[PDB]
Enzyme design. Structure first.
Site, mmCIF file in Angstrom:
data_model
loop_
_atom_site.group_PDB
_atom_site.id
_atom_site.type_symbol
_atom_site.label_atom_id
_atom_site.label_comp_id
_atom_site.label_asym_id
_atom_site.label_seq_id
_atom_site.Cartn_x
_atom_site.Cartn_y
_atom_site.Cartn_z
ATOM 1 N N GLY A 24 -5.643 -8.227 3.948
ATOM 2 C CA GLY A 24 -7.057 -8.496 3.576
ATOM 3 C C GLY A 24 -7.042 -9.834 3.082
ATOM 4 O O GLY A 24 -7.211 -10.717 3.593
ATOM 5 N N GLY A 58 -4.771 -11.671 1.418
ATOM 6 C CA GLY A 58 -3.698 -12.299 1.237
ATOM 7 C C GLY A 58 -3.269 -12.892 -0.163
ATOM 8 O O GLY A 58 -2.356 -13.845 -0.231
ATOM 9 N N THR A 59 -3.753 -11.835 -1.175
ATOM 10 C CA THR A 59 -3.482 -12.656 -2.570
ATOM 11 C C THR A 59 -2.453 -11.660 -3.348
ATOM 12 O O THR A 59 -2.206 -11.782 -4.695
ATOM 13 C CB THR A 59 -4.699 -12.477 -3.353
ATOM 14 N N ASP A 85 -9.321 -10.839 -11.225
ATOM 15 C CA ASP A 85 -9.445 -12.237 -10.972
ATOM 16 C C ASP A 85 -9.457 -13.065 -9.608
ATOM 17 O O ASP A 85 -9.515 -14.172 -9.429
ATOM 18 C CB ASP A 85 -8.295 -12.960 -11.987
ATOM 19 N N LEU A 91 -11.099 -11.971 -7.065
ATOM 20 C CA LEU A 91 -12.147 -11.209 -6.235
ATOM 21 C C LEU A 91 -12.609 -12.224 -5.440
ATOM 22 O O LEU A 91 -13.427 -11.558 -4.607
ATOM 23 C CB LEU A 91 -13.161 -10.923 -7.469
ATOM 24 N N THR A 140 -9.815 -7.649 -1.499
ATOM 25 C CA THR A 140 -10.763 -6.817 -0.644
ATOM 26 C C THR A 140 -10.698 -5.492 -1.053
ATOM 27 O O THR A 140 -9.683 -5.085 -1.787
ATOM 28 C CB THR A 140 -10.454 -6.831 1.080
ATOM 29 N N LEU A 148 1.664 3.267 4.871
ATOM 30 C CA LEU A 148 1.402 4.489 5.319
ATOM 31 C C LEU A 148 0.293 4.400 6.758
ATOM 32 O O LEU A 148 0.351 5.416 7.487
ATOM 33 C CB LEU A 148 0.710 5.287 4.300
ATOM 34 N N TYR A 165 -0.101 -9.290 -20.599
ATOM 35 C CA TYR A 165 -0.093 -10.303 -19.359
ATOM 36 C C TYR A 165 0.559 -11.752 -20.039
ATOM 37 O O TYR A 165 0.288 -12.229 -20.942
ATOM 38 C CB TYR A 165 -1.508 -10.724 -18.948
HETATM 39 C C1 LIG Z 1 -4.637 -15.691 -8.750
HETATM 40 C C2 LIG Z 1 -4.396 -14.088 -8.792
HETATM 41 C C3 LIG Z 1 -5.071 -13.252 -9.591
HETATM 42 C C4 LIG Z 1 -5.210 -11.844 -9.638
HETATM 43 N N1 LIG Z 1 -5.638 -11.107 -10.495
HETATM 44 C C5 LIG Z 1 -5.755 -9.608 -10.301
HETATM 45 C C6 LIG Z 1 -6.324 -8.734 -11.110
HETATM 46 O O1 LIG Z 1 -7.235 -9.283 -12.025
HETATM 47 N N2 LIG Z 1 -6.073 -7.495 -10.926
HETATM 48 C C7 LIG Z 1 -5.314 -7.030 -9.984
HETATM 49 O O2 LIG Z 1 -5.363 -5.747 -9.729
HETATM 50 N N3 LIG Z 1 -4.771 -7.748 -9.019
HETATM 51 C C8 LIG Z 1 -4.873 -9.096 -9.072
HETATM 52 N N4 LIG Z 1 -4.165 -9.879 -8.356
HETATM 53 C C9 LIG Z 1 -3.303 -9.308 -7.138
HETATM 54 C C10 LIG Z 1 -4.081 -9.158 -6.029
HETATM 55 O O3 LIG Z 1 -5.243 -9.934 -6.078
HETATM 56 C C11 LIG Z 1 -4.396 -7.738 -5.918
HETATM 57 O O4 LIG Z 1 -3.276 -6.888 -5.712
HETATM 58 C C12 LIG Z 1 -5.093 -7.256 -4.759
HETATM 59 O O5 LIG Z 1 -5.449 -5.847 -4.799
HETATM 60 C C13 LIG Z 1 -4.715 -7.433 -3.409
HETATM 61 O O6 LIG Z 1 -5.811 -7.756 -2.422
HETATM 62 P P1 LIG Z 1 -5.833 -8.171 -1.043
HETATM 63 O O7 LIG Z 1 -7.143 -7.909 -0.265
HETATM 64 O O8 LIG Z 1 -5.550 -9.679 -1.397
HETATM 65 O O9 LIG Z 1 -4.639 -7.597 -0.330
HETATM 66 P P2 LIG Z 1 -3.549 -8.239 0.460
HETATM 67 O O10 LIG Z 1 -2.626 -9.211 -0.285
HETATM 68 O O11 LIG Z 1 -3.880 -8.928 1.784
HETATM 69 O O12 LIG Z 1 -2.681 -6.843 0.591
HETATM 70 C C14 LIG Z 1 -1.919 -6.187 -0.506
HETATM 71 C C15 LIG Z 1 -1.213 -5.105 0.037
HETATM 72 O O13 LIG Z 1 -1.883 -4.129 0.499
HETATM 73 C C16 LIG Z 1 -1.852 -3.984 1.947
HETATM 74 N N5 LIG Z 1 -3.024 -3.751 2.558
HETATM 75 C C17 LIG Z 1 -4.138 -4.670 2.455
HETATM 76 N N6 LIG Z 1 -5.226 -4.328 2.940
HETATM 77 C C18 LIG Z 1 -5.131 -2.864 3.387
HETATM 78 C C19 LIG Z 1 -5.726 -1.932 3.994
HETATM 79 N N7 LIG Z 1 -7.217 -1.775 4.484
HETATM 80 N N8 LIG Z 1 -5.220 -0.893 4.261
HETATM 81 C C20 LIG Z 1 -3.871 -0.386 4.052
HETATM 82 N N9 LIG Z 1 -3.065 -1.679 3.548
HETATM 83 C C21 LIG Z 1 -3.529 -2.779 3.109
HETATM 84 C C22 LIG Z 1 -1.125 -5.192 2.456
HETATM 85 O O14 LIG Z 1 -0.219 -4.753 3.622
HETATM 86 C C23 LIG Z 1 -0.155 -5.570 1.159
HETATM 87 O O15 LIG Z 1 1.033 -4.821 1.261
HETATM 88 C C24 LIG Z 1 -4.106 -11.482 -8.407
HETATM 89 C C25 LIG Z 1 -3.677 -12.378 -7.461
HETATM 90 C C26 LIG Z 1 -3.598 -13.566 -7.703
HETATM 91 C C27 LIG Z 1 -3.060 -14.766 -6.729
#
Ligand SMILES: Cc1cc2nc3c(=O)[nH]c(=O)nc-3n(C[C@H](O)[C@H](O)[C@H](O)COP(=O)(O)OP(=O)(O)OC[C@H]3O[C@@H](n4cnc5c(N)ncnc54)[C@H](O)[C@@H]3O)c2cc1C
Ligand SMILES: Cc1cc2nc3c(=O)[nH]c(=O)nc-3n(C[C@H](O)[C@H](O)[C@H](O)COP(=O)(O)OP(=O)(O)OC[C@H]3O[C@@H](n4cnc5c(N)ncnc54)[C@H](O)[C@@H]3O)c2cc1C
EC number: 2.5.1.26
Lengths: 543, 555
Positions: free
Chosen positions: B147, B149-150, B214, B216, B220, B282, B475
């Site tokens: 989604g 990529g974070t 953070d 957001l 996704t 899954l 943290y």
């Molecule tokens: C600068 C920074 C700040 C952050 N702050 C926070 C915070 O405050 N709180 C927090 O919880 N996390 C935080 N994170 C971590 C990260 O943003 C979270 O874990 C977020 O939930 C991942 O979202 P994404 O859409 O980027 O998923 P991705 O990184 O794109 O995917 C994360 C994982 O979920 C899987 N995936 C993605 N989409 C789906 C889908 N639709 N169905 C099934 N699997 C899927 C992927 O395969 C991967 O294994 C931060 C990261 C960074 C770099």
């Protein structure tokens, strides 16, 4: 508050609750609860007969099959056990109307072969090892208050069935005052848990209506909800750690962190598992300082929909009190009829309130709730209409046994639903019950009543009571069971869930696949087949 | 707020965030963020250079093909008929081969990945997803969903020895709000919608989720569910497990969905919790219903200074005991206090370098809700804080603290230009373990770095970011000047794994929110027990018996 091993010495072998508490007509011709246990024990109820007569039109063993070598190894452990008929029959049922019939009027098809009373986690590990070694089936039992057939032994189960009774595994092991958590053995009852915590200045606040008998382990197994979840949470918010003995080994997390992201939450694989996976032996639960003050209240509304709209606005403003329940007119009257001495009175509905916390905060919150209520035509109706509809709640199941003496059969059932479905669901379900009963030859219109019993951001828990005078009815159980199954169809067609809190057991099994999906069902199966590959834990609930 | 298909046109290919936003030295030699997107953008930071010079010991004058796409021809022919958009281009694949761990970004900056996706697909709906997972069964393909990529857990990285064609299933074009139910205060959404775009579109109707991790801007719905995300205002809105009322998930076995929208049930083990925290192993979460709330009337920032960190932790604990935590309360140690101070406007002199100014800790506060309730709650919380030596330190200081959170991830990329490597990490712990865990973790990091030949003492700093009834989320930030060190990545990764050992030995969890991915797999069994490990395995073997979902996270 410890359940003795020989339950029937204190509890009814054929009904709810304590031997010393049963409704009777006092020397003034009026219903009264026997004994001294409850705030309403010994309190005359001068209008209760009038209400019952008006409402209903009335005037007023199998041998023990057990392997000799198993029994020999059991003797070495020094775990207490019984093969006596009364001990086995006592743990062969919960509190469904059907069972309570077989228990008063006949015999069950299958009952446990032997009862074991482990006093700790290690004893439980011993017993599950013996069950593996001797090919035994285990049905765990705590309070025996299941209303889902979750204790009933499968008729065709040919293994020796152990009733693994948890009631002697009932100590608070530690209270952590830094973190406000208590670690307890899972057979402890609500009542005994609260009593011992209160001596330290603490409570859990978890108060399901069955708390005098239901146990921590049973709450976790059935996803129990209590009367004050608005402040304290339901069972899934309260539990922070647990330890589970399965045939595959012991499940326990390595830390007591308050929230983790370490994969799918395996606590959720055990909560709601209804005795099918292993024995929950110990759990850590959140605790709170005992509140300083409690106040009851009540509000009258000109009809049910105005009440539901008011509860909805209170939930939208997130200012629900400790408990808020909305009773329809029949349920209200039921209450009004139960006193110890404008608005069209046919549709007029009543909310009961409970507030708890600091005196000054409570009175401030009380003001706010009455002001939201006035916007919906709600008017304060008094503490006693409040105080009393909640003293009432620990007594209603003693009323069910009284009905059976006078040819009245009744049961409650529940669901949860989105806010936008609550009004139509209540109306359509009550009408389905009236229709089925008439179609099935029930002479007198049944009692068919509801209340909103919990509010949530996304919707409400709705609770129904259904009862009727079965005069001139051939088969009153079959009429009643068909009518229940029909009401559940009506619930699910109106957007309500299969269960909010009672659980699925064997009663609601047939709807589960549809409710959680095929793959959902396949997933519950896969965990079962891994943790318990030879089905030791065979009460056959859920799947 | 929709992520475009060609991400590198808007987003940095080799770092965090938007191309238009980076730190650079000004025409007066002051650090400054380019562009126009944040409150700090185009604002010169005259003291930031000194702080970096003082904390890292550097000057700031001294700065610093792809594998072929292997894809079955018949598969590609059937893919063409579905009209689902796709790409075999090296820059689209490379962009989706990593999240935001230090190691990955270092690898993007100084070379190449061992394995990247063979093809990127962009489904626009649940039915497209179903088609794609049917194709992967038919043609024996591997899928890694992505989604935002974070991920900071190696959760996107392709296993090096995965020999099947890997599809990067990108959800970013599946981003609609399908309905907003004002009666139930729920919104049903496709899982690729970003936090920022979801909040933007609800706000037009009068609503928000309040879920504000953070990341957001780019993370996704589907990602938050997969990783059990936590956001800044969980105290009012809940974390992801409280926010989700319903979800639909496409697995190789079929579609998982409950048949009703009831708010709480007792129908066996809650299958939503089999999916939350599954980290892409899954199936694909396609849609989810989420609670929503009216946009708050009023927000009020604040801050409070305490004589030291211990007193500050004791004050947070009392606020949690009284259950009156504001929408956000964060306590920063003295090093973060000093840092935030080094970001202000004032140009100091070049000839100049009741509270002890270097023990003092600061909490930043945010309250939001109805104006009347907010102000009584603020008064309550300040009354508690005074009991602990707390002194109100100003709303401007609290507001600035809040804004700053979105700009810190651009600071990481700046440090890389100057030989500075850093990462954050997190845990949750009981109340009684917090002070010792903070202290011992920070000292383990200093000790490891000295032992491994790091020249200057590293930056090792912590904050309490969430309060709970039974504990708190802590943290940490860790960074050093690696100039002089042979294998920078090995030293970092070894010190990070040592810190995690220290956290676990001090009664902390393996993760509060970032999750397990492939980064923390080696502690998982110990954390959840062997049988609990086994139960996760059994669900994965049932729902995905051929391991189509092969990122190899968790297990
Ligand atoms: C600068 C920074 C700040 C952050 N702050 C926070 C915070 O405050 N709180 C927090 O919880 N996390 C935080 N994170 C971590 C990260 O943003 C979270 O874990 C977020 O939930 C991942 O979202 P994404 O859409 O980027 O998923 P991705 O990184 O794109 O995917 C994360 C994982 O979920 C899987 N995936 C993605 N989409 C789906 C889908 N639709 N169905 C099934 N699997 C899927 C992927 O395969 C991967 O294994 C931060 C990261 C960074 C770099
Ligand atoms: C009058 C009355 C009022 C009630 N009010 C409420 C209420 O307000 N809220 C609510 O949620 N429920 C209510 N219930 C239902 C019932 O009390 C709950 O489901 C309760 O959690 C059952 O607990 P128990 O200890 O009595 O379990 P039991 O009835 O002994 O067992 C329930 C199930 O759990 C399994 N089990 C029991 N203990 C263990 C253990 N240690 N490990 C593993 N499996 C175990 C059993 O095998 C069985 O499947 C009520 C019931 C009655 C009859």
């Amino acid at each position: 508050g410890i359940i003795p091993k020989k339950r029937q010495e204190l509890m009814k072998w054929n009904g709810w609750g304590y031997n010393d508490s049963k409704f009777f007509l006092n020397k003034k011709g009026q219903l009264e609860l026997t004994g001294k246990r409850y705030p309403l024990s010994g309190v005359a109820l001068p209008t209760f007969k009038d209400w019952i007569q008006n409402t209903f039109g009335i005037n007023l063993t199998p041998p023990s099959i057990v392997n000799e070598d198993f029994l020999h190894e059991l003797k070495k452990t020094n775990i207490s056990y019984s093969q006596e008929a009364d001990d086995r029959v006592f743990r062969a049922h919960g509190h469904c109307l059907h069972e309570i019939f077989l228990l008063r009027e006949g015999m069950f098809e299958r009952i446990p072969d032997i009862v074991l009373w482990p006093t700790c986690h290690d004893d439980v590990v011993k017993i599950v090892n013996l069950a593996c070694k001797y090919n035994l089936c285990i049905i765990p039992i705590g309070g025996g208050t299941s209303v889902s057939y979750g204790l009933m032994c499968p008729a065709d189960e040919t293994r020796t069935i152990i009733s693994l009774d948890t009631s002697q595994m009932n100590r608070i092991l530690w209270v952590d005052e830094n973190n406000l958590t208590a670690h307890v053995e899972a057979g402890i009852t609500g009542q005994e848990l609260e009593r011992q915590l209160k001596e330290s200045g603490y409570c859990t606040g978890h108060e399901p209506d069955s708390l005098e008998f239901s146990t921590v382990g049973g709450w976790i197994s059935t996803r129990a909800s209590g009367m004050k979840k608005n402040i304290y949470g339901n069972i899934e918010d309260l539990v922070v750690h647990m330890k589970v003995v399965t045939p595959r080994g012991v499940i326990e997390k390595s830390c007591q962190g308050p929230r983790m992201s370490t994969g799918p939450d395996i606590h959720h694989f055990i909560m709601g598992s209804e005795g099918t996976l292993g024995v929950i032996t110990e759990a850590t639960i959140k605790i709170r300082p005992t509140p300083e003050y409690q106040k009851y209240g009540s509000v009258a509304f000109p009809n049910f929909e105005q009440g539901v709209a008011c509860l909805r606005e209170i939930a939208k403003q997130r200012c629900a009190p400790a408990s808020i329940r909305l009773m329809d007119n029949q349920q209200f009257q039921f209450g009004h009829a139960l006193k110890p001495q404008g608005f069209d009175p046919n549709q007029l509905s009543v909310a009961t309130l409970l507030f708890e916390g600091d005196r000054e905060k409570v009175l401030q919150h009380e003001k706010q709730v009455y002001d939201i209520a006035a916007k919906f035509g709600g008017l304060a109706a008094g503490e006693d209409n409040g105080q009393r509809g909640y003293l009432l709640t620990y007594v209603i199941a003693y009323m069910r046994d009284l009905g059976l003496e006078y040819y009245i059969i009744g049961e409650s059932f529940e669901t949860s639903a989105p806010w936008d479905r609550v009004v139509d669901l209540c109306r359509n379900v009550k009408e389905r019950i009236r229709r089925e009963c008439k179609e099935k030859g029930v002479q007198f219109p049944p009692l068919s009543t509801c209340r909103v019993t919990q509010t949530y951001d996304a919707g409400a828990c709705i609770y129904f009571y259904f009862a009727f005078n079965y005069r001139g009815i051939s088969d009153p159980l079959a009429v009643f069971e068909q009518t229940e199954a029909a009401a559940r169809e009506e619930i699910l067609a109106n957007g309500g869930s299969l269960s909010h809190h009672h659980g699925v057991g064997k009663l609601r099994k047939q709807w589960l696949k549809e409710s959680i999906s095929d793959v959902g069902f396949g997933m519950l199966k896969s965990v079962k087949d891994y943790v318990d590959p030879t089905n030791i834990f065979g009460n056959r609930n859920l799947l």
